[PDB]
Design a binder for these strands. Structure first.
Lengths: 129, 81
DNA sequence: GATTTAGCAAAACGTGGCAT
DNA sequence: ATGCCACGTTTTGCTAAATC
């Protein structure tokens, strides 16, 4: 009591966002992986959702999507490489996820100059993003 | 003394999952970290092994040993977030 | 050749509640 | 407060295909 800064239910989750961000560049790091960094999937999901506002598994995909998108525009790293690097089983898989998220094919997104920061979830996950 | 050694772990400018997780283990000063056993700290159900690289970097680049007892590290004003 | 796509199935997940 | 099932959902996985 007598703090007016952070919440007890918040501090227990205020060590998951950073964990994911520093573990999504290569590994999958979903609820099951974050289980060793918090609690059981079904419990962590509930706690994460009631803190950040978004779902864990949802957040993982959302952040990875925008991260790859940036590397498709700023960098010229091959789609197949980015896929395998980010934990995707195949380029086809990444193409599916990207298309069902940004609605634009990964290869086209790389050439689309009109496309910018749209549907780009940031490593905050607390205020709409 | 070292300018960053007397700084909060949350404001050491490291990676993502490192500085923020360290201040969640009652560590708000690097002085505690240098006297902390990595074998236990990195085993905490949250701390990542990828953070060890940055943590060890701070100690190594400062000439600090694992669990090196400091004569004086906590000043007058020492609070948490 | 490269990219994108066809479906199918599963896995987890989305949550609610439940249990301790 | 911690653990769990179920229902459902998304994704996933999988073989291929199609387009560029």
């Amino acid at each position: 009591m007598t703090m007016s800064r952070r919440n007890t239910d918040a501090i227990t989750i205020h060590s998951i966002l950073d964990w994911i961000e520093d573990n999504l560049e290569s590994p999958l790091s979903l609820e099951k992986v974050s289980e060793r960094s918090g609690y059981s999937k079904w419990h962590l999901q509930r706690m994460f959702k009631k803190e950040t506002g978004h779902s864990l598994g949802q957040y993982i995909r959302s952040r990875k999507m925008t991260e790859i998108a940036q590397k498709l525009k700023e960098s010229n790293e091959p789609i197949l490489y980015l896929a395998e690097r980010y934990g995707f089983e195949s380029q086809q898989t990444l193409t599916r996820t990207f298309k069902n998220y940004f609605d634009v094919p990964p290869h086209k997104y790389r050439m689309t100059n009109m496309q910018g920061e749209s549907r780009f979830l940031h490593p905050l996950n607390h205020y709409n993003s | 003394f070292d300018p960053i050694l007397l700084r909060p772990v949350d404001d050491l400018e490291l990676t993502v999952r490192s500085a923020n997780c360290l201040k969640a283990e009652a560590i708000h000063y690097i002085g505690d970290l240098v006297q902390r056993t990595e074998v236990e700290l990195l085993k905490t159900p949250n701390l990542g092994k990828k953070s060890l690289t940055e943590i060890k970097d701070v100690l190594a680049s400062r000439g600090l040993s694992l669990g090196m007892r400091l004569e004086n590290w906590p000043p007058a004003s020492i609070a948490d977030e």
